[model samples]
Target chain A: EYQDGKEFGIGDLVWGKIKGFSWWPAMVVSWKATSKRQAMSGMRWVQWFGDGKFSEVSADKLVALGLFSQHFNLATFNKLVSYRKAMYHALEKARVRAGKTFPDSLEDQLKPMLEWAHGGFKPTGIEGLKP
Target chain B: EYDGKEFGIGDLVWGKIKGFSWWPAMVVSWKATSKRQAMSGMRWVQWFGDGKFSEVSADKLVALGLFSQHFNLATFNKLVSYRKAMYHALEKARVRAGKTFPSLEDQLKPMLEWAHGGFKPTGIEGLKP
Candidate 1:
């Protein structure tokens, strides 16, 4: 019944059902074009705002939330900040362990890994270094 | 230079970030004495969202609401089972036809389009329209 051949790009704020449950907001962080090797797979990466977890989903599964992005209640806002702060600390610890200098700010720290920043960053423990 | 009273683990409080609104939190641990004065002796706190624990100080938080069940897990599980069973049947049909299973949205697209004509019995168990 849905006939629109919609295309989404990285950093598009969208909503989609996760695990067959309610629609939740997420950010499209990655996508792979269809290739001959994987005919039935055109997976996109999305980061869930709820648990801050990323998962591979089919592009068709996502429905753009568009301008109707949900507003966060005070509690939800606090929770997001706290979750993000914890994530920052985790990355900072990992970076320090790898002998990198302390990041100047939260934005600076996240810029390297944020999908909207570069083409997107997937932490893989410093390139060329043995973990 | 910090002069806030001390707090122990398991204390309920509200926490505030530097440039954000306040929210409920619970103190989970204490920091070492060296960093105590710098952060009002705050060590760790678990925020209400996603139960995230952080190193915010107790001095920056205020006590608030208690945690409760957010959703009905029992009913949720039942719904999940129904969805899984329906998808399982769908996949079985695809496999029998030697075709790959379609995406969830793809599967729903045609059904949604058909619905415009009016409700029709799909006869598929757990997917009655």
Candidate 2:
């Protein structure tokens, strides 16, 4: 039986909105640090699992979109970005009314997240990592 | 020495939002669950580690402004739960006057997660399995 008390790893896929912009494919690029300062440091910096090879993003940029199957197929990548984008938009609207400043210039540089945050991101189903 | 390949665990301290909530605390929590589902969840359930005892919330509900220090404390409980409740309210507002569809139960749910098509949870924080 599974012990049910294991830690998350570096290769796992996570979901989050970049700079509070839109949710997208965030991957576990590194292991959790041992010190207090590294524990939940927002994100250990993850790479975009769907967009080929790019710089890693922060954990804060990725939210919990839930676990993908263990098959390690293209579906996982699609699910990662698409689902995250949806969650990002949903959360962005929520943040806006709570008296928060969401839509900013950061959205453009981080277009994916911005679209999810603002209201203009559409998933084509094929925009996933080819893993 | 301990092996470097072990996984991350629960009850571990994590970080917080910088000035989004406008709180002057350290912005980290003493309590946190795995990042994936409950067995692989995002926030199995957490308690703020500002300097006291507390319940928990989502990893997504909170941000990784930075990692927290390793010590017993009670602060973010007010800040931790407070942030999530705040995130919930924000998510609610997102769908309130928009074209999202479900139209938000129009109440005090998770605001964001509750408004989406799939807010599947983990770690009791995101999921309850």
Candidate 3:
């Protein structure tokens, strides 16, 4: 999503809430059209591979539906965890496969993410749970 | 090490230049002292590994030697990349003892940690150099 001289490119994850579309996890693929000598001013492009392989969507069309980037802060994680139940159901419908909730060696990857949302309540020794 | 209202703990890497000590690369191990209520205040605990297990003296003691945190940003990595001849010598001794350079995946960890004054560069595919 480019606006006000900001450039977004491939592999950048955005947090967005589409009207009918779910409100989490979108990665930018490319621009629908190129803007010359400028940072993609007021243009349209498709965001791919979040809920499904849906295509031909514009930035405004997507933005009008309301999606945002998730990299801003811990607050985003807080919100994502807050709606984990609703998101879980949505995930079920998408048939999305999940990976290790926490990576080994890096402690606090998953547990602290949850604790950040649930007011620092450390879960019971979630240690040594898969990579 | 802790100052006024801030807390410092283990694995919290810092940057420093010493008189006879040397320059670049250090990791923290534990708090020197803990405050009852507030965060740890002006104190010296200890930091180890990466060089030697030298006992530390003071927050002020290390300061005279110009020790400091390296995590703020790019400037740290850029400068530390400096005097590479020195770092390479130090690493050559340590890594050779370990048997080889770190595994590719391990070297790829975090791609230039701001906290640690290092950067990751593109690696050759399949060829572990």
Candidate 4:
């Protein structure tokens, strides 16, 4: 989405939500549009990193912070980290309302994101789930 | 321009320039493959953090969803290490092991300093050299 002189093109990281979930990390994979730029009414095809499932989501249902080129500054990086933590806390507070519970597998799948959201250090790897 | 089996729109990719600083990039738009498309759109690539772009081809692109290989970190590193040799690996394997992988900021931090007038533009896009 273009605003403030920037365009959120492909592969940008975004946090998205659906009817039964809170803001969860996803990436802008593709879109369905009939215009030069995607239409404002177009649906973004995002794949959730945790589950690897794709969903067509509305722009209003997504948030892309720290995805811009200019966010390369040190101070701004810290701010985005802080903001990420805040977003995590806020969403979890509303997590269980009316069976909006995300699977434990999701939390497991996105463990790195979970840690990052808690102001934890980035790890060498986000390990895969075992059967 | 693409079929379901190939890498298509929104696939994070690294277009190889061969022996240069690795570029973290994404596949942007793909033109129609139909005949009589005279005006011509392109198979475009947009750099991740740097935001530059180019018209490119598949032979140069290290394009595949690492996660789609069922999160194959073992083989993923092999592919990425190969591209890193070409100067352009850093997709979701890196993204997972490191969300700090596609964490363009971390990758771009050094590349930023590398990109001076003489060096590659790593940090701070442009200025008086």
The numbered model that scores best in lDDT is: 1
**Candidate scoring better on DockQ of 1 and 4:** 4
Better of 1 and 3 by TM-score: 1
What residue pairs clash in candidate 4, if any at all?
A: B22-B87, B98-B101, B111-B122, B112-B122, B112-B123, B114-B120, B115-B120, B115-B121, B115-B122
After superposition, the stretches of candidate 1 with alpha carbons farther than 4 Å from their true spots are A1-4, A17-25, A31-44, A49-52, A57-75, A78-131, B1-122, B125-129
* Poorest lDDT segment (10 consecutive residues) of candidate 2 chain B: B63-72
Per-residue accuracy of model 2 over B17-51 as CA lDDT, tens digit each: 34434221212222332233332222333322222
Write down the TM-score of every candidate: 0.25, 0.22, 0.21, 0.28
Candidate 2 stretches with Cα past 4 Å from truth are A1-7, A31-42, A52-131, B1-129
Provide the lDDT at A100 for model 1.
48
Model 4 chain A: weakest 10-residue lDDT segment is A122-131
How high is the lDDT of residue B119 in model 2? 31
The C-alpha lDDT values of all candidates are 0.41, 0.33, 0.30, 0.40
User: How do these models rank on lDDT, best leading?
Assistant: 1, 4, 2, 3
lDDT for A81 (candidate 1): 62
Error of 2 at A102 (Å): 40
Interface DockQ of each model: 0.01, 0.04, 0.01, 0.02
Estimate candidate 1's RMSD in Å.
22.6
- Model 1, residue A24: distance off in Å is 4.8
- The candidates' interface RMSDs, in order, read 22.5, 9.6, 21.6, 10.3
Every prediction: chain A TM-score: 0.39, 0.31, 0.32, 0.41
Model 1 residue A126 CA deviation (Å) reads 34
Cα lDDT tens digits for candidate 1, B1-129: 224565555444456677534544445433311122235565565453323456775556653321112222343245543233223323322222233222644573443333222222322221210
Model 2 has how many clashing residue pairs? Answer: 50
